[PDB]
Symmetry: C5
Subunit: 342 residues, 5 copies
């Protein structure tokens, strides 16, 4: 017998199957088991606070009205064009901003019915899910991206969503990200919603992303430290070398400003302060104070042996004072961003 | 009895229900109560003057032709595919530039009919609403974003829109914005339209957004002030140090110009003047005048004891005159932008 | 009687109404009166030469086959889903690159039929209309944007388009533009097309846009003038101060180049010369000549009393010669761009 | 008689017209004459190698099965909704990456049938056609854009495409391009394809685009030449002026680097060398050699009358040697890019 | 006889053809032979890790139920509108993020049936395929782009995909890429998938892309080397020339920083270190050490004949030491990136 003809007998008007009535309409709720396979992951943007995924979604549930025993085959396949003749759960993604299905060649959907009445429903789709980001410690920050699966109009006494026991969420190997690193550990939660109407089923997954630091370390932190160090060689130059010392100080200030201005074009645009901003401001303050040191030294010396000793004392003190304060600032800055980060 | 079969009897040709005829076609107008739940908020742009939202819209009204008493159930659910068989209000958003519905998995729409005839209609959609912006005080500015709900072809004697009493507008917790802060207070208005045809119902909501200032303060205002201060140390250098003083002045001017040029790439593009532009121009004028001070001083001295006293008097006067004028400008600038802002 | 049932009798097969036959098929042409209400205006781009509008379009014409007298009501409303059962003009926008209708909630369309047979047809749509731009005087330029309404396949002996007498075009209050100013005066034209087939009806509107100048004046013209002025203080420095004068000249040249390079990132990208480009080049030429003046002066002096007088004469002449030529250039530049602009 | 009723008799089941059978199914092939009218032209990009057009396409062919003599009218118009009931050629654009039709108001399509059986089919559509570009001589380059019209599944013994004799291709007046100039001369070709199946008809048009040079000349070539000239004034300064000469040389190098860095942001991004790159590198090499000249001169002089003569000889030789080599390079560079360009 | 009427007899209800039943439903699997012709290739982006293609896909398989002998014609063509009445393989692209078909003029699809029952199915479509990239050696890197063809719901005992023997993959001549070079060699693989359900057929192709180096060599590597060389001329200047030597060193540092900042805007944005970053950092370290050399030399000399000899010894050693270390670094850097690259 034709499988299509058998499916017609199973789900036609003579059978009386109603696609708008859920299975077990009188008694216990329907239990749906879900799996997610992630094919691609990326397009993480802070201007819109969202990311893009391409996933495989599989749902399994039992429909006692679809049980059959006459047909020898143990499974039956349904045409994607007739999927509206069967009951399906009204799943939707809560934090979703855009989605679509895939139609290249044939429609990317599959539905299978077994002898006992179990239904397997696997579909492929692309999502744009929103995720808030903090960026308060931007060079050293960890972000969490979630994905919520919810029912639209069924309460907990009608529909229940559960994760699989073996492997709910899997990620294809070889995926890379230009800016982040996706950790292998994932969390499965129960974010049940409580409204006036009642409780609504909802399951959640969490992804942890860590940002790499090599480019920032080699392109922003090291040159700033080198410029700050170069600003210290003024204290080792003779005090009667004003056209050299003043020029060196002002050119170090200019170099610091050009470095900071160049670094701004390749950073996220936010209105609040970040750790790299704090570092940049402190380096600018250091190279700014280095010039006032020599300004104070030149005035005291010109004032008319005691005067020329006091001017030299300031240089000898500064030679050891400036690196010590810089080191104290460095250790304070690094411990609170590499330890106080959980 | 099947709920779908009962709905067919209620809204079929035998019943004679007409979807193109509003409820109470002869007498009083229809009253519609509206709720809005905001899921996401962002994508605020000044180039296009618009923002993006993802909302839940709920409408409630009474239809006496849909009252039923035979069916034991107190509520009935309608299939989203047959929503064209029932009368719905012709609501639309007046300041909308783009909208779409959501179809991932099942269509994201719901319609419920109660025994007395009340109808609940909840749908999910994404909007692109336009909002004019001023940006005349750009670092310290407050913007207001509105959302207008209007009827397309029904006058006030046929259709009336009202807000809920309990909670018209709600916002999901945890929403963040890269540039603005959304205040918790919202306004509900009655922006009724008066045309030649007649009065048309319209309700409005207002959102207040405040821009943060930490990044601008730490990256634009402070370095400019530091450069202006550095330009003042020329007055404390010996007047016979022309290769030092001239070089310091011209390098401070160059540093100011590089800072201003670097800051321009990360600002909104408008054709009118802003407060940050005023600040930048004043700082440039100060560092420009500092060099002319020394130009005047070098000429008077070379002219051939009275001459060398007059040159020193200018330096001694400038040492106190320049910071005083800068302080006066600072307090004048800050009070009119932090007080005269309502 | 049901209005829908009456409309069925009026426009059914028993009536014999044909939607593919224009009114007055044998005799005089159909006269259509048009109104346009503009809701939003913006997204003006020079890379693609186009702008975006959101408008309300209303058309009115008389159909003698739709006259009715039995029904007491003075007006009848047609369902948007059945709009294909009535004859409508084949209007289209000639300079249009993209358009779409609005479907949020219900379709944004309306059709009304009166007793005498008059038809009112109001619809809402979004356009992307193309407009060529010159940008030859870019800081001080006026652009004109047009909007053409044309018939696709009807000649002047079948279809005629006319503007309203009272108010063809209206603009909603409160619209702002980030770069331009929209003048309140509009033009109504008759841009009838003449082809081999015959004359085709076409009406036109014109919008005048003026660009603001405050940002450009405060950020490009003033700093360049300040740098040019700073380049003149070399003539007031002692001629035996080569490490000061040469450094000041070359640093002014460098500052001019940095200002010009920074200003380029925020300007329209075209391949022809603009007024701001002319100004930038002239300022660079001035600061370039200022250094050659001192180069000539240093050589004549070293050559071995008559020689040291000739060198001083050049400085004394230049002190008055350079600002005079700059002033002459300034007045010549400004009069031809603020007067010869119509 | 109704024209629609006559068309029904002409192309109904009683007539037996088959839309899947080409005219003259047994004998000679069908000859189709094509016209193209271009409404807009632009959006030329090198990152994607494509351009955008909005055109009117007209096709004419003879169908002997559609000849009529009973109806007095000499022409008949077909409804755009019933265009699938008639045979049309399967034309498509070979180098097309994206296309769509226009539906604002009514569908922008037209089909007319004459008494002898001739068919006129005019439609409006938007294309995104791909064009490879070289950019090897980027400031002075000419690009050619093509447009291929091909049949999908008909060989030369079934379908033949021909251009019109009078005016195949026309361009609307007033079109402007921000970067290129469209020449008035166009080419018509026969790019017939030869495959295993057989010969397939294909016609081609070519457009020639020339890039303007005013902006590049006034903003890149002239300032570089001015900086190179400024680097030559070191040879006219006294050899015992090291803090002036060294500073002038290094500042000219820095100015050259800043100019080159600023110019890079507004150029096409390719991985191969361009003429502007060659010019930039040569200018940098010149300003680099100018400093080594003075480095060599200072060492020879300090070495301890014969020594001080040799140092002066180098300066006197360089004063004439450097501009001569620069002039030779200039004429060599310009002749091979303005003559060897065909 | 009409070919459409013959096709109706062949694939109608009287024939009993079922489009949901694969050929040879009881026995051996179906063998499908595939060809791919690439029309365009480009839009390679590292922010989204994907590329765009426009291809022709051809599939051939044998259907014994479609064999015919009555009709004299050796081939029959099927209408694209009725393609759902025939069985087609459920091919899909595994690494695909977006796809669409082409409808300009007629639909771009073709299906032919021969006498023995063979089916030829050629269609045109556009893809957006994802490809991970490394960019760890960014100036000198080779990337591989794949394209996977897979079945959605058929195991290896039902459906098998094979490449053609003669020419599976062909590329149109004249294709260019702004950044890469496409090698002429391609690979054909068998990437069969093993799941819990069973084995699924899958074929793969690989494309090798090489990045050109001319622009990077002429714009980044050469100027950095020139600046490093210019930093070495300090060792040939007299040690008592502090205002010259210090200024030259600090200006070389500033020039290096400006070059590095300018080069950053035109590079891919990643968070890990690249070869160009390593080169930039080493050049900055060299120009940084050159200034400390003179700082050490000036202090030793001022300390108060033995002292003035030790200071000169450092300069004489550095004159040969610095270029030697630079050369060693250069050869080490180039051999490990031009040899250790496979
Ligand atoms: C769906 O799962 C729930 C949870 O296991 C089932 O509800 C339980 O059913 C068992 C019967 O074996 C009862 O003993 C439990 O008390 C039920 N749980 C609760 C909280 O009441 C439910 O039966 C399942 N649905 C179906 C159709 O089997
Ligand atoms: C919709 O609301 C309006 C406003 O309350 C109702 O109009 C009023 O109806 C009451 C009857 O209880 C009258 O006493 C008032 O005079 C009415 N207001 C006005 C301004 O005339 C209207 O009845 C409501 N619609 C329905 C169907 O109940
Ligand atoms: C549409 O408008 C035109 C222009 O007014 C009408 O044509 C005129 O009709 C009057 C009749 O009252 C004649 O006296 C004029 O000579 C006509 N103008 C021309 C140029 O011939 C036309 O009648 C209108 N259409 C309809 C249906 O009334
Ligand atoms: C389409 O055009 C071709 C080319 O002119 C026609 O083929 C020619 O027909 C004439 C008959 O007048 C013959 O004398 C020529 O020998 C034909 N050319 C070739 C190359 O064989 C063809 O007849 C035209 N199609 C129709 C339907 O008229
Ligand atoms: C599809 O191709 C496969 C592989 O060649 C065919 O399977 C083989 O069929 C031959 C019969 O000529 C057997 O001798 C081989 O043992 C088969 N291979 C295996 C691995 O069992 C298959 O018959 C082809 N399908 C059709 C419909 O002809
Ligand atoms: C020493 C000064 C110089 C700059 C200062 C920082 C500037 C701005 C901020 C951001 C603010 O939100 C918390 C304090 C903090 C982090 C300051 C801490 C103290 C600080 C590091
Ligand atoms: C002291 C000068 C220097 C620059 C000047 C400003 C420059 C431009 C503008 C914008 C104009 O719209 C109002 C006046 C205002 C704000 C000026 C006020 C006075 C001012 C602050
Ligand atoms: C004095 C020189 C220096 C630069 C010159 C301009 C440079 C380029 C152009 C553009 C050209 O199209 C017309 C002449 C014009 C406007 C020149 C006019 C004369 C000019 C202003
Ligand atoms: C004199 C030197 C300095 C730079 C050199 C050019 C640098 C790079 C290229 C690109 C190459 O593809 C052909 C040679 C060419 C064009 C060189 C020609 C000779 C040249 C102009
Ligand atoms: C000599 C120093 C200066 C900078 C150094 C490099 C800086 C950073 C990296 C990236 C890291 O992942 C491997 C080592 C490597 C490549 C270092 C190798 C040694 C190095 C070249």
């Amino acid at each position: 017998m034709s499988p299509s003809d058998f499916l017609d007998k199973l789900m036609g008007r003579t059978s009386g199957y109603d696609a708008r009535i859920r299975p077990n309409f009188k008694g216990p709720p329907v239990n749906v088991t879900c799996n997610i396979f992630i094919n691609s992951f990326g397009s993480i943007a802070e201007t819109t606070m969202d990311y893009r995924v391409n996933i495989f979604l599989r749902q399994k549930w039992n429909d006692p009205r679809l049980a059959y025993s006459e047909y020898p085959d143990d499974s039956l396949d349904l045409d994607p064009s007739m999927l509206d003749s069967i009951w399906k759960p009204d799943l939707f993604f809560a934090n979703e901003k855009g989605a679509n299905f895939h139609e290249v060649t044939t429609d990317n959907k599959l539905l299978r019915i077994f002898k006992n009445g179990n239904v397997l429903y696997s579909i492929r789709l692309t999502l744009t899910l929103s995720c808030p980001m903090d960026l308060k410690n931007f060079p050293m920050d960890v972000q969490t991206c979630i994905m919520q699966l919810e029912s639209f109009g069924y309460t907990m006494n009608d529909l229940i969503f559960e994760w699989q026991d073996e492997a709910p969420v899997q990620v294809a190997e070889g995926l890379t990200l230009p800016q982040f690193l996706l950790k292998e550990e994932k969390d499965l939660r129960y974010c049940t919603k409580h409204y006036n109407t009642g409780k609504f089923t909802c399951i959640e997954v969490r992804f942890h992303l860590e940002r790499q630091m090599g480019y920032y370390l080699i392109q922003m932190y090291i040159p700033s430290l080198l410029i700050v160090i170069l600003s210290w060689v003024s204290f080792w130059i003779n005090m009667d070398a004003a056209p050299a010392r003043v020029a060196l100080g002002i050119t170090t200030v200019l170099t610091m400003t050009t470095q900071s201005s160049g670094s701004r074009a390749s950073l996220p645009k936010v209105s609040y302060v970040k750790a790299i901003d704090i570092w940049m401001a402190v380096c600018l303050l250091f190279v700014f104070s280095a010039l006032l040191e020599y300004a104070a030294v030149n005035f005291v010396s010109r004032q008319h042996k005691v005067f020329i000793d006091r001017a030299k004392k300031i240089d000898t003190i500064s030679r050891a004072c400036f690196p010590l304060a810089f080191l104290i600032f460095n250790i304070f800055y690094w411990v609170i961003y590499k330890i106080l980060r959980h």
